Design a binder for this molecule. Structure first.
Ligand SMILES: [Mg+2]
Ligand SMILES: [Mg+2]
Ligand SMILES: [Mg+2]
Ligand SMILES: [Mg+2]
Lengths: 347, 347, 347, 347
C-alpha cells in the first residue's frame, strides 16, 4: 500500500509500503522527519500545542492510496531506534511485546492452579491476622480484607527477565547485538503465532551496531517472519552502504528520499530498461545488476557536491538509473592520469 | 502525680493527676488553655516565636510535686478531641496504635510460615514458565527469575482495613459513636498488652456526641483498662451535666477549674465534713451524697451571675462544699409562697 | 423554612430553620448524625460507596416544606466545629472566607499599580537573563519566557496572617477564644457587605471553650449580623445548660432533638398555654417564664433514667411543656425529709 | 592520551585520544562495545553482578600509556546518542549544562538588584492591605506579613524555557537537526567559559540524521570549541561514508577498529610513505590524497567478503595503506574489456 505523510509546508511524502519496506536516501533530515511523524502517529503520541505548531495547531495526518485517512490505531506499533528500546519491549510493562507474550504463557491450567494455592495462603494470612486484631464491638467489626493476587500482578512485581549463557547471567547490554535482535524476533514470532492483528515494526540506527554479515542473518529472519505472518510489516532505514537488500519481492518498497522522492520499480523491469541504455554489449548479469542497484540506490536523485567514490560500472548504472527517473545528476568520468598503471597495479 | 502547669500571667495551675483524671469547672477558657499546653507539651509540638511570645519566648514547663520538670517525653500522648482523632489512631500509618500493634504481630510464625508456601508456589510458577518460554539464540537464553514476595508487599498491595456489619462495609462515620469509642479502646487494649511504656490519653468534646447511658459503658471500659494497665493514664474534660463520675478511687483526681483551682478529696471524708453542717438530722445516704457531688461539682468555686437551677438538696450541698473550700458563693433561697401547690402538682 | 433531613431507616429529621437556628436535645447521637449529614450535604462531600452504604448506595437528600430538594449548592457553607476550622477560614486557601475577603481588598487601583511595577522588574530579570543565555541559531532561539505575577499568586505564596497585641505577635491559639470568634465574625461582616449570596454557618463544640458571659457577647454579634444581612443563616448546637438563647424572634427555630423531634412555638403562645396549666395563681413573669424555658428546653421530650436536678418551678414548667407536646415524661416531687429546714438554711 | 580499554577476552583496546577523537571501522560490534564501556566507566554507572559477570565480577578498567588507571572521575561525561540526549542537556534540571550555567549567573547584581525593587514593592502592597484590613477585637489585630520573594521561586513558578522562531514556540523535535546541534554547542560554550574542569563528549548516531553539508558546519563549530577550551574532548563515531574528517591536527586521533586496531599518523607522513609505492609517477596532490583517506579509512584493516565499490584511485590508496599497516587485504582489479566505452559514457 501507500502512506502519504503530511509535511509542514510541502506535498505529502509518498511511501510505498510492503511486508519489508526500506527507506534510504541522502536527505537525512527528511528521513528523520518521516520517522518522527510515523512514530508519533502510530505510537500514540499525545500532542501538545507546541508539537502542532508547524501544522497550524492541527493534528498531522497520513493518507492511503485512495487519499483516505490511515487510522492511528491501525497497527500494533513497535519502534526500535536503539537496543534500549529492544530491552524495553522484553520487560513486562504496559504495551510491550513481553506483556502480550508472557500473558499468553502464564495463562495455563497448570499455572493458574498455583495461583489458587497462593491465594489460599493469603486467605490464611488474613484469618490468622484477624484473630489477633479482634476489633469487634456489637454488630461492628474492624478487619483487614484481602485483594486476591493476579498473575498480571505477579509478573509486574515479582518477576524479571535475565539472560544467561550456560546458566551464567550477564546483563542484556553484554549480550551480542545480533543475539539481542534474534531474541527479540523470537519473542515476536511466538506472539504473532497467536494473533491476526496487524503489527508494524520500525527499525533504525541498528546497521551501525552490527557487521554486514550479522545483518544478513537478521534480515533473513525478518523475511521468514513476513512470509509466515501476512499481518506483519517492517519499515527499515538502512545506511548508505552494505545494508540495503534488493530482490524481486521487496524492490518496489525501497523508497528513495533525496532531492526528490521515488520508490524503485520491479527489478526485471529496471534491468531491461538499463540494459537498453548500457553503453556496451557486455551487459551486466542480472545478479551483477542487482548488486550494482543495491550499491547505488541510496545515492539516486541527489545532486551531490562531492562525487561518491564508485566503480566504473556502478557509476554508469547510477547515471542510467537517475535518467530513468528524469533526474539530471551525473557522475563524470574520473580525471586521473595513467589509469592503465593503477589498473595493472590492482592485478 | 501533681502537674504544676505554667500560666502566662498567674501562678502555675495545679492538677492532681491519677489513672482517670477529670477536669471540670466553669472557667472554660482556663480549661481550654490547660488542654492546649498539655497537648503541645506532651504532643511534641515544635514551638515558634509566636508560640512562645506569651512566655517571654521561653519554652513553657510542667513541674511535679517536687518542683522538678516533668519530661515532655514521659508519655506516649494521644489527643482525642474529635472522632476523626479516634480513626487516625486506627489507620495503619507509621505512628498510630494499629500500626504499632501490627508490627509486634505480623512477624510471628503463625504467619511467617505461610509465606514459605506462597513463595515455594512462586518458584513453581517460574519453573513452569521457563519451560514454556523458549527463547534461545546462540548460547544466550532468556528466562524469568522471581523476586520473593514479602509480608510488607502483601499488606500494602493486597490488604485494606474495613468497618463492616455482617460483611457489609460502611464508613467509620456511620459506626455508632459509642462503638467508635469501644473499637478505639479495644485497639488500645491490644497495644498496651505489648508494652509497659507510659500512655497519656486526653478526651474532650465526646460527651455531646453520645448519650449519658452510653458514656457510662465507655467509662467502665476505661476503668477496666486502667486497672489492667498501670502505665495508662486518662485525662477527661467532662460537660457540666451528666458525665462527671465520682467514685471512691478517682474522686481525688477530679479537678475543678473555675474562679479557683482545687481537686476533690476522699468521698467518705467529704461526706462526713459536709454532714457536720447539714441543716437536717436526716442526712442523705452516702449514695445520695455521691450523686449530688457529680451534679454540683462542676459549679463549685464559681461566683455565678445567673444562679443555677438545682433541687433543694443539691443546692444545700453546693453551699456547704463551697464553704469547706472557703469559697464565698452561696445559692440564695428562691422563696415562693405557693411551694405547697407546686409540689402537689409534681404528683 | 424547613429542612427534612434523610435518615437511614426512619422518617426524615424535621428542622425548622431561621436566621438563628438552635439544635438542642438529649439525643446526642441523632444531633451528631444531623450535623454529619448537614456538613456533607452542603460542604461538598464526594461520597464513596462506603459512605452511601446506609442509604442503599443512593446519595442522601434534604427536602424543604414543599418536599422539594434543597440544592447542595444552595449555600456558601462554613463549618466551624473547632477553633482550628476558624483559623483555617482566615487563611488564604481555596474556598475559605479569607480568600473571598482578601480578594476584595487586594482589588484596588492603588494596589494593582504595584503589581504592574513588579511585573516590570520581572520583565527586566527575564531580559537581563536572556542576554546571558544567548541560545540563538539561525531563525531559532532558546529563551526563558515569564508568566506574569498575579495577586492571587502573591497572596497564596508570599503572604501569611498574623495576630498581634500592640504590635507583638502571638500565635492564633493563644488569642482569647472570644477574640477568635470576634475576629472571624468581623471578617465575615466585611465580606457579606459585598455579596447577596446565601451563607450558612454551622457552629458546634464552642460552648465548652468560653464562659457563659463571653458566649452572650458572641451571640449578640451574630444577632447583629443576621439582622443586617438577610442572606445570613446560623445553625448552632448549644450545650444543655447556660447557652441556649430564647426570644420572640428565634423561638420557633429552636429544634429539640430527643426521644422525639419538635421545634418550639412562639413564646407568647407558650406562655399563655403554660399559664393556663400552672398549678398556682402566682404565675411566673414573662421573663421568669422565658428563662425557665431556656433552662428546661434541652430536656424536653426525654424519658430520663435520672431526674435532672432542677428548681421546683423549672420542674413544673418542664412537666407542663412536655404535656403540650403530648410527651408523657414527668419530674416527680422530690422525697427529701425536712425540706423546711433546707429551705431556711438557704436563707 | 592513550586509552587501553579492558576487553572481556582479548588484549585491551588501544585508542589514541585527542581533542577531537574519531572511532571508525568495520568492526561494528567492537565499536559498540567500546562505546558501552566508555559511557559506563565515565558515566558513573553503578555495576551489578550481571554487569560485571563478563569480567569475572571485577570492575573493568581503562589504562593510560603508563599502564595506570584513568580515574572514572577525570571527566564530566556527556553521552549524545540521540537528539533526546541533546535536549536533556538543555532542560534546567540538576546535573545538566543549562542548569549549571544558570547557577553561575542568576546570582549577579545585574539581576539580584531588581529583586530589591520587587520586594520593596511587596512591602508596599502589605502596607496598603493592612490599612484597608480592619480586624481588631480587644487588643488583638489581624494583619498580613509578606514573605520575601526569592529568585528560585520566580524561576520555578514564573519561568519556562521555549524554542521559538520569531516569538512562535515549537517543540524541540521540529527545530532543524543541525540547529539542535548548534544550540547544544552554544550552550556548551557558555558553560565552558565558566570552568576549567575536563569535559568528555561522545557523539554517535547523529550522521544519519543530517546532511553531509550540515555536518561540516557542525564539525567546524566543535573544532572552534576545542581550540577555545583545552579541557574539552570530543569522541565521535562517524559513519563509513562522508563524515570522517582528516586534517593535519586530528588525523593522529582517528582510530580504526576492524579486524585489527590502529590509529592513523601525521598526514604528510602517510602521503610520503604511500607515494613511495604509488604505481604512477604522477602522484595525487596532497589534497586529493587527504580526500581519498577520508573515503578509504573506514574500510582499512578489514578482510571483506564483498569487495567495496571505489574509484580506481581510492582502491590503489586503500591497498597501499593496508600494506603500510602490514594488513593482507587487497582490492582485486575488477577488469572489464569495455573499460573504454564506459568512460566515454561518463562524458
Ligand atoms: Mg548520507
Ligand atoms: Mg459552663
Ligand atoms: Mg445531655
Ligand atoms: Mg559497516
Amino acid at each position: 500500500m501507500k502512506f502519504f505523510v503530511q509535511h509542514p509546508y510541502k506535498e505529502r511524502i509518498e511511501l510505498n509500503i510492503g511486508a519489508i519496506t526500506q527507506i534510504v536516501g541522502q536527505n537525512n533530515e527528511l528521513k528523520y522527519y518521516t520517522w518522527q511523524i510515523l512514530s508519533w502517529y502510530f505510537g500514540g503520541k499525545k500532542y501538545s500545542s507546541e508539537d502542532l505548531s508547524i501544522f497550524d495547531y492541527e493534528e498531522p495526518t497520513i493518507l492511503d492510496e485512495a487519499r483516505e485517512i490511515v487510522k492511528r490505531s491501525s497497527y500494533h506499533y513497535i519502534d526500535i531506534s536503539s537496543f534500549k528500546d529492544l530491552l524495553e519491549q522484553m520487560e513486562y510493562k504496559k504495551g510491550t511485546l513481553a506483556q502480550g507474550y508472557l500473558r499468553k504463557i502464564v495463562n495455563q491450567v497448570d499455572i493458574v492452579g498455583h495461583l489458587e494455592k497462593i491465594n489460599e495462603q493469603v486467605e490464611l494470612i488474613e484469618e490468622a491476622m484477624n484473630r489477633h486484631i479482634n476489633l469487634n464491638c456489637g454488630q461492628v467489626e474492624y478487619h483487614l480484607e484481602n485483594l486476591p493476587l493476579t498473575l498480571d500482578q505477579l509478573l509486574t512485581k515479582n518477576f524479571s527477565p535475565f539472560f544467561a549463557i550456560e546458566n551464567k547471567n550477564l546483563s542484556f547490554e553484554w549480550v551480542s547485538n545480533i543475539d539481542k535482535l534474534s531474541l527479540f524476533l523470537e519473542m515476536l514470532d511466538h506472539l504473532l503465532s497467536q494473533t491476526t492483528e496487524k503489527y508494524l515494526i520500525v527499525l533504525k540506527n541498528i546497521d551501525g551496531f552490527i557487521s554486514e554479515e550479522s545483518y544478513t542473518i537478521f534480515y533473513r529472519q525478518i523475511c521468514h517472519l513476513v512470509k509466515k505472518y501476512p499481518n506483519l510489516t517492517f519499515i527499515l532505514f538502512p545506511s548508505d552502504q552494505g545494508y540495503l537488500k534488493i530482490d524481486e519481492e521487496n524492490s518496489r518498497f525501497v523508497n528513495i528520499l533525496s532531492d526528490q522522492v521515488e520508490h524503485l520499480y520491479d527489478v526485471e523491469f529496471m534491468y531491461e530498461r538499463v540494459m537498453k541504455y548500457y553503453p556496451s554489449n557486455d551487459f551486466p548479469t542480472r545478479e551483477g545488476f542487482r548488486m550494482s542497484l543495491e550499491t547505488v540506490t541510496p545515492y539516486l536523485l541527489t545532486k551531490m557536491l562531492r562525487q561518491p567514490s564508485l566503480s566504473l560500472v556502478d557509476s554508469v548504472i547510477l547515471n542510467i538509473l537517475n535518467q530513468l527517473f528524469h533526474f539530471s545528476y551525473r557522475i563524470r568520468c574520473s580525471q586521473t592520469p595513467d589509469k592503465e598503471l593503477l589498473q595493472k597495479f590492482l592485478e
